């Protein structure tokens, strides 16, 4: 027998479910999202960093011109200049005057430090969610990691757990992303070969050690002017460093849904978004026969003063009549309320008590013990503390957000208006017939 249920994709929340393989007594089930690892499919578009403009010592010729032989070096943009007649510490380095020419050669390579602070550009594709789940069912419990796609059985032990697809698909990464020093930024980096001066990606390569370096930097060289040999040149400020100054805020400080962001590999962790469909073919050896399990002849729900809040601010007490002592399962059949406990040692006759948490101001949640069901009913008061260090353990719905008495009032108002217009209709019809019968 396989049970199935939706589970809130909220890390650390011990969401509970009750299985009802009726040939056996109910069994308590908890589906707890220990962690999530939404991993995007990505590739290294290119590495980038602060380029280093190597200006290899210029080639000089003392009796003729020099060809600007092109090179595969990145942003290779060498120029030949006449009338150079350059000096050096000792003196002039050429024979003639105007007949000498000079070739100034410059290109760019990754600065030595780039090995560490290099911005790996990555394209991002629809991330497949993976979650580490801790599952407990009766005294048996197991922990597992299932990729939430809805097809793979990320089974562990005997649990044939299957998860997904997500109720709502969400990826915190934009179509384009960049990683720096373990920080990560959503950013429309220029594609491979799209280098532009003074901007991110001015220098790029398949990998930092690779020779396949391409660059656009507006590097240009001026005609040598000073008496001493020199190669005055200018360039846009290193686009990587320019972006560094104006990087904005990294995604680790900006991703929604509370996603933590981890690098190596890029992934979103412990993110809390939507619901995870779950099915679990629990080993039926885990059930106990309904006749061998305890069962309760009668039970009633008396709920004490309860607070609706994220924590277990509610408390209730259940009287029971039971055939035999043992450990009955206990669970909430109503989505608006969840109990802290999941099982209770129960005697032949006595009073159980349970701590519970709910978001609805009313307590009309059907608590169940050993499968018997009782409607709890009471007003829960608003919480005295505005903030707590724990997420709300349950969602809320408008059908349950309206309070019992407030709901009664609102419906009484609409009932009044509807009944009044009904009276209008009735009197119109009646008066018409009263007149026309004798007209």
């Amino acid at each position: 027998f396989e049970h199935a249920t939706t589970v809130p994709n909220v890390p650390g929340i011990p969401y509970k479910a009750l299985v009802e393989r009726a040939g056996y007594a109910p069994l308590n089930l908890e589906i707890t999202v220990v962690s999530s690892e939404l991993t995007p499919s990505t590739n290294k578009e290119y590495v980038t960093c602060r380029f280093h403009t190597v200006i290899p010592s210029p080639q000089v010729k003392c009796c003729g011109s020099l060809e600007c032989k092109a090179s595969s070096k990145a942003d290779y943009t060498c120029r030949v200049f006449g009338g150079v007649y350059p000096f050096m510490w000792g003196g002039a380095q050429c024979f003639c005057d105007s007949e000498n020419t000079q070739l100034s050669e410059a290109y760019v390579e990754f600065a030595p430090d780039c090995t560490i602070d290099h911005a790996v550009a990555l394209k991002v594709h629809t991330a497949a969610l993976k979650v580490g789940l801790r599952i407990v069912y009766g005294n048996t419990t197991a922990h597992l990691d299932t990729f939430v796609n809805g097809v793979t059985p990320g089974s562990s032990r005997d649990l044939k757990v299957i998860a997904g697809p997500i109720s709502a698909a969400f990826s915190p990464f934009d179509h384009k992303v960049v990683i720096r020093k373990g920080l990560v930024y959503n950013y429309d980096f220029p594609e491979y070969g799209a280098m532009k001066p003074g901007a991110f990606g001015d220098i790029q390569a398949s990998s930092l050690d690779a020779t396949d370096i391409v660059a656009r930097t507006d590097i240009r060289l001026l005609k040598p002017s000073v008496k001493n040999i020199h190669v005055p040149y200018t360039q846009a400020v290193s686009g990587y460093e320019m972006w560094k100054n104006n990087s904005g805020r990294p995604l680790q400080e900006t991703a929604p849904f509370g996603c933590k962001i981890e690098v190596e590999p890029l992934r979103a962790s412990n993110c809390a978004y939507g619901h995870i469909p779950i099915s679990i073919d629990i080993p039926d050896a885990a059930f106990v026969r309904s006749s061998e399990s305890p069962t309760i002849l009668e039970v009633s729900c008396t709920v004490a003063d309860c607070i609706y809040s994220a924590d277990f601010g509610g408390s209730l007490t259940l009287q029971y009549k039971a055939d035999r002592e043992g450990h009955c399962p206990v669970h909430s059949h109503s989505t608006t309320a969840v109990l802290k406990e999941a099982t209770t040692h129960v005697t032949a006759v006595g009073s159980i008590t349970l701590h519970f948490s709910t978001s609805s101001p009313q307590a009309n949640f059907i608590v169940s013990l050993c499968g018997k069901k009782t409607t709890c009913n009471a007003e829960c008061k608003p919480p005295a503390d505005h903030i707590i260090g724990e997420p709300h353990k349950v969602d809320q719905e408008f059908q349950a957000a309206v309070s019992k008495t407030s709901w009664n009032w609102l419906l009484a108002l609409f009932g009044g208006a509807s009944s009044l217009i009904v009276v209008g209709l009735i009197v119109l019809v009646c008066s018409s017939m009263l007149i026309n019968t004798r007209r």
Binding site: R249, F257, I387
Partner: protein, 51 residues
């Protein structure tokens, strides 16, 4: 490398809103984001003592 840890901000709790009292003699980065459908993320370098 060691980094400092400014005195933990004293929180104040009120209706759907929290007040952070902060104290750092040196520029310190504060970042806040809602865990909802939208991040509404914001970042601010606080200095001195402020709320």
């Amino acid at each position: 490398c060691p980094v400092p840890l400014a005195h933990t901000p004293t929180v104040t709790k009120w209706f759907k809103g929290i007040t952070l009292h902060l104290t750092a003699t040196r520029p310190t980065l504060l970042t806040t984001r809602k865990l909802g459908l939208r991040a509404d993320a914001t970042a601010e370098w606080i200095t001195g003592t402020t709320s």
